[PDB]
């Protein structure tokens, strides 16, 4: 929000207002990276972002320690050499290459497409980076007429996805990536758990309406009461509601789930991919931005 307007106070003391992304900018299939980046916490034209850039973003401006995106951090970099053929040091090209498919990008998403999903012929692909309004419906469906959600319910979720996946994916495509995704079901209740609940810390609930906000307008959610987490979240808590999420018992099977879709996942680790391997093309839509309403600056 705009400096003056006092609105992050007093657990963002230093805010900048949103301005839509343009036609030549890049984001991300990333709603935090695209709200940072609608900020100018990271860069406004989504190119050339270095890690302490990135860093002092998720802390100063979502509540986000540093070890919560070490991991993610090592991931965009490695995505990065394999995408433009080079390392990239410490500037990250652009946010754009993060969605190459089969990589840090994946299938199954809460709020995206799949690159070949619904596609009538093996070489088409689509946009699996940009926000989907219908993807995203599919998932706050499982959880319609809540205000909030728990663990179990989120595993509802991704199954839901995970089911929908597989079945609209070209034949072959779909793969199933729990261990990436759930860290990102951890993110979910870093962010936007309801911290005004006195059990926040150890029985998380996601309020609803601040992540529909999150995911739809690639802004924060302050005008429906949201701050930044104060205390700083950390990595200890996203991967333990990880590890919760997916011992969180299903009450409700979908058909065509992928092989042991059900239990626990594997930790998330650093990606590696061949030499010889060619990248993807990426998907080259405009990047979203939110029109119904389009946003102010202080929104
Ligand atoms: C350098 C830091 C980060 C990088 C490089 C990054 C990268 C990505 C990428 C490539 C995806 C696409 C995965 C997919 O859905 O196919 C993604 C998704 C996602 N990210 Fe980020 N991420 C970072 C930090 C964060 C943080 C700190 C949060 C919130 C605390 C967050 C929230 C999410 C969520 C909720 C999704 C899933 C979106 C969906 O499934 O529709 N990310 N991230
Ligand atoms: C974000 O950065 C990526 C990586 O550099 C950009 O994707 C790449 O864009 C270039 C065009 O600038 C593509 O190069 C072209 O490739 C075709 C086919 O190989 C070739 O015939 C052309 O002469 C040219 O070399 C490249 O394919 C593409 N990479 C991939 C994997 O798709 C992306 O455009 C950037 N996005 C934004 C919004 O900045
Ligand atoms: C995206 O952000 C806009 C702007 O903040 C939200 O629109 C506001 O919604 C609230 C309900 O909390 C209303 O009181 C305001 O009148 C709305 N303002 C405008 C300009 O319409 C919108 O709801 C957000 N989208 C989602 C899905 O959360
Ligand atoms: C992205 O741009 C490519 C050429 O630059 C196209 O060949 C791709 O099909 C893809 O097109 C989509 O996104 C662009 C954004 O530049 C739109 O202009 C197209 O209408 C289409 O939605
Ligand atoms: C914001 O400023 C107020 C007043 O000086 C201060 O009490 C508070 O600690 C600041 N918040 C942060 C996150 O620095
Ligand atoms: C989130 O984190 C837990 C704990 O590491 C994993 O088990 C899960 O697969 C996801 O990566
Ligand atoms: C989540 O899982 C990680 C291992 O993946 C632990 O290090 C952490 O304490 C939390 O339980
Ligand atoms: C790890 O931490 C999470 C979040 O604090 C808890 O909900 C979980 O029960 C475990 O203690
Ligand atoms: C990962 O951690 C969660 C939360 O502590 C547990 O519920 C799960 O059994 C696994 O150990
Ligand atoms: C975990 O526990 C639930 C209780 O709701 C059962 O529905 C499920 O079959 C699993 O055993
Ligand atoms: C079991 O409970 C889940 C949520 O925990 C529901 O989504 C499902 O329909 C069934 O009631
Ligand atoms: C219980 O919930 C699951 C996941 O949302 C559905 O796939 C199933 O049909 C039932 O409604
Ligand atoms: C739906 O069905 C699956 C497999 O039968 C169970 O694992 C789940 O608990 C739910 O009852
Ligand atoms: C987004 O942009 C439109 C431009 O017409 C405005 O109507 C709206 O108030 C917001 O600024
Ligand atoms: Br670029
Ligand atoms: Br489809
Ligand atoms: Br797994
Ligand atoms: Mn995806």
């Given at each position: 929000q705009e400096p003056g307007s006092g609105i992050g106070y007093?657990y963002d003391n230093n805010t900048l207002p949103y301005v839509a992304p343009?036609?030549?900018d890049?984001?991300?299939?990333?709603?935090?990276l695209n709200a940072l980046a609608n900020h100018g916490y990271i860069p406004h034209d989504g190119?050339?972002?270095?890690?302490?850039t990135?860093?002092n973003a998720f802390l100063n401006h979502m509540?986000?320690?540093?070890?919560?995106?070490?991991?993610?951090?090592?991931?965009?970099?490695?995505?990065?050499?394999?995408?433009?053929?080079?390392?990239?040091?410490?500037?990250?090209?652009?946010?754009?290459?993060?969605?190459?498919?089969?990589?840090?990008?994946?299938?199954?998403?809460?709020?995206?497409?799949?690159?070949?999903?619904?596609?009538?012929?093996?070489?088409?692909?689509?946009?699996?980076?940009?926000?989907?309004?219908?993807?995203?419906?599919?998932?706050?469906?499982?959880?319609?007429?809540?205000?909030?959600?728990?663990?179990?319910?989120?595993?509802?979720?991704?199954?839901?996805?995970?089911?929908?996946?597989?079945?609209?994916?070209?034949?072959?495509?779909?793969?199933?990536?729990?261990?990436?995704?759930?860290?990102?079901?951890?993110?979910?209740?870093?962010?936007?758990?309801?911290?005004?609940?006195?059990?926040?810390?150890?029985?998380?609930?996601?309020?609803?309406?601040?992540?529909?906000?999150?995911?739809?307008?690639e802004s924060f959610?302050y005008?429906?009461?949201?701050?930044p987490?104060?205390?700083?979240?950390?990595?200890?808590?996203?991967?333990?509601?990880?590890?919760?999420?997916?011992?969180?018992?299903?009450?409700?099977?979908?058909?065509?789930?992928?092989?042991?879709?059900?239990?626990?996942?594997?930790?998330?680790?650093?990606?590696?991919?061949?030499?010889?391997?060619?990248?993807?093309?990426?998907?080259?839509?405009?990047?979203?931005?939110?029109?119904?309403?389009?946003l102010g600056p202080n929104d």
């Open positions: 007093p343009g036609p030549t890049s984001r991300a299939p990333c709603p935090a190119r050339a972002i270095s890690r302490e990135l860093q509540g986000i320690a540093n070890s919560v995106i070490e991991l993610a951090l090592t991931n965009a970099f490695v995505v990065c050499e394999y995408v433009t053929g080079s390392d990239c040091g410490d500037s990250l090209v652009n946010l754009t290459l993060l969605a190459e498919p089969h990589a840090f990008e994946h299938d199954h998403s809460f709020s995206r497409k799949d690159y070949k999903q619904g596609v009538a012929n093996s070489n088409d692909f689509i946009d699996n980076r940009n926000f989907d309004a219908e993807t995203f419906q599919t998932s706050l469906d499982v959880v319609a007429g809540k205000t909030h959600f728990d663990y179990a319910d989120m595993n509802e979720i991704r199954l839901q996805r995970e089911s929908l996946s597989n079945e609209l994916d070209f034949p072959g495509w779909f793969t199933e990536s729990k261990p990436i995704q759930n860290v990102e079901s951890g993110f979910i209740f870093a962010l936007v758990s309801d911290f005004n609940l006195p059990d926040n810390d150890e029985n998380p609930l996601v309020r609803i309406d601040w992540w529909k906000y999150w995911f739809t307008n959610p005008h429906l009461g949201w701050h987490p104060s205390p700083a979240r950390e990595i200890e808590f996203v991967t333990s509601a990880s590890s919760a999420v997916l011992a969180a018992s299903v009450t409700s099977t979908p058909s065509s789930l992928p092989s042991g879709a059900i239990g626990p996942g594997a930790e998330a680790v650093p990606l590696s991919f061949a030499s010889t391997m060619t990248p993807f093309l990426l998907a080259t839509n405009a990047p979203y931005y939110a029109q119904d309403p389009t």
